[PDB]
DNA sequence: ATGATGACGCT
DNA sequence: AGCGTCAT
């Protein structure tokens, strides 16, 4: 009762552009807008495999991991974007760009969390508080939510989408008290309202159209986020979980896509993530241990408290290559060339990394992978990084690895590596 | 033969 | 440290 929390301490938002790398590639080349189009990387193989999907394309069928021949059955007049290739590999560096954009405007607005090249969380709670001494008990208007969602509703006693939207929204500010300052759902609320007008500022200032989802915990705002895409913005409340769970595959809930997911079904005998409540919280530690077992028990209810942290630039900055099948490397020259290409891009995302940033990678990670093995890394070993010189770090990562080559013959490696990987890590400031 | 990334937990 | 899981 009077004692319980509710988890509705936060307003917490996560904003994912929409199609990412597709729109920085339709921005660059109208011709490309409003189509079917996908990106894609290395044509040579069965026209590329597809990383990206534009939503006229996905009507088609076109997935991810498709290779664009295949997509091409599917949707015939699909137009594709390849990424760009240097020094023998797909490079980021345009997409990368994007992303500082969107999360500098992001970063105007509150402290991010970048989760990846196309998410950041946001905390919105100060914010919040903030604006609401500004408004003075004034009502929310419907102008200010113009592409928000309210999950749940319309409800109780119009056929097209927007219809639906309008209908639900307005089913939401009527019911809003507006007085109570402490509010949840208004502080929801305005979170959605500051939160339209950053993807406003993000599509005014980039081009680029994104999606978002406001609610009281980053897991509940990554889930609203994907309900309703793209280019719209989902508010979940605190009240809207049990419905919305009620029917909700564990799987969707970010950290049970996996193994972890998978067992709670099994072992439970479920298929929600609302049926976890009828367990205790002993009862589920018992058996997905302490961490999961108290996350799972207050996350099916709607409550969790892993925090939006102050972080805009990856802690790692990496290069992988694959050798699959028959290219895998099985001579040493082939094996010091590519991790000369490796650190020739790694040195110069490092230079320019050091220039905008003020910091400096001190650690060296190496990883290879060896045919036959089922894992995708078959082995990491680290080494100081001392300077930013491309000759000094390809031969170091060389020297790290040079004794996994099983052949007796100097000349050849053994078994051949079906995977590169060279990753700066443990920065400081500079 | 998806591939190229990146964060974080466990021991 | 080195390995594994989960994710974009
Ligand atoms: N397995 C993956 C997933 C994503 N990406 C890249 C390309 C995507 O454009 C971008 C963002 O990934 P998302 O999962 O957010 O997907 P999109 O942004 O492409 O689409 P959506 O509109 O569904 O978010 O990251 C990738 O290279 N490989
Ligand atoms: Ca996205
Ligand atoms: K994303």
Redesign the pocket.
């Known amino acids: 009762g009077p004692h319980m929390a509710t988890g509705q301490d936060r307003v917490v938002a996560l904003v994912?552009?929409?199609?990412?790398?597709?729109?920085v590639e339709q921005r660059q080349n109208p011709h490309l807008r409003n189509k079917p189009c996908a990106?894609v990387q290395y044509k040579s193989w069965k026209g590329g495999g597809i990383?990206?999907?534009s939503?006229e394309a996905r009507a088609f069928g076109v997935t991810?991991?498709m290779w664009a021949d295949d997509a091409k059955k599917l949707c015939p007049d699909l137009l594709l974007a390849q990424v760009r290739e240097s020094r023998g590999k797909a490079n980021?560096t345009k997409?990368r760009e994007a992303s500082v954009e969107v999360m500098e405007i992001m970063s105007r607005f509150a402290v991010i969390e970048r989760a990846?090249?196309?998410?950041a969380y946001v905390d919105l709670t100060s914010a919040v508080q903030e604006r609401l001494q500004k408004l003075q008990g004034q009502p929310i208007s419907a102008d200010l939510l113009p592409s928000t969602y309210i999950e749940g509703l319309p409800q109780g006693p119009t056929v097209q989408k927007e219809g639906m939207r309008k209908q639900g929204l307005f089913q939401w500010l009527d019911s809003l008290q507006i007085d109570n300052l402490t509010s949840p759902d208004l502080q929801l609320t305005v979170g959605a309202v500051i939160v339209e007008e950053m993807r406003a500022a993000i599509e005014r200032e980039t081009g680029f159209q994104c999606?978002a989802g406001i609610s009281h915990n980053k897991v509940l705002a990554k889930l609203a986020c994907?309900l309703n895409?793209?280019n719209r913005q989902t508010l979940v409340s605190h009240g809207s979980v049990p419905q919305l769970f009620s029917q909700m595959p564990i799987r969707k809930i970010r950290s049970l896509g996996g193994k972890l997911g998978a067992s709670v079904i099994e072992i439970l005998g479920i298929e929600y993530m609302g049926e976890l409540t009828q367990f205790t919280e002993s009862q589920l530690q018992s058996h997905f241990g302490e961490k999961n077992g108290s996350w799972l028990y207050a996350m099916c209810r709607g409550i969790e408290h892993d925090p939006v942290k102050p972080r805009q630039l990856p802690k790692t900055i990496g290069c992988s290559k694959n050798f699959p099948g028959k290219t895998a490397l099985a001579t040493r020259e082939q094996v010091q060339w590519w991790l000369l290409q490796l650190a020739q891009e790694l040195e110069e995302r490092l230079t320019k990394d050091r220039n905008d940033n003020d910091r400096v990678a001190t650690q060296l990670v190496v990883s290879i992978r060896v045919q036959g093995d089922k894992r995708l890394s078959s082995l990491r070993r680290c080494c100081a990084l001392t300077r930013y010189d491309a000759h000094k770090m390809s031969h170091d990562a060389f020297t790290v690895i040079k004794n996994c080559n099983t052949s007796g013959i100097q000349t050849e490696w053994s078994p051949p590596l079906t995977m590169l990987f060279l990753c700066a890590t443990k920065f400081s400031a500079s």
């Open positions: 994912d552009m929409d199609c990412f790398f597709v729109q990106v990383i990206a999907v939503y991810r991991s980021l997409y990846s090249i196309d998410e999606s994907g895409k793209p």
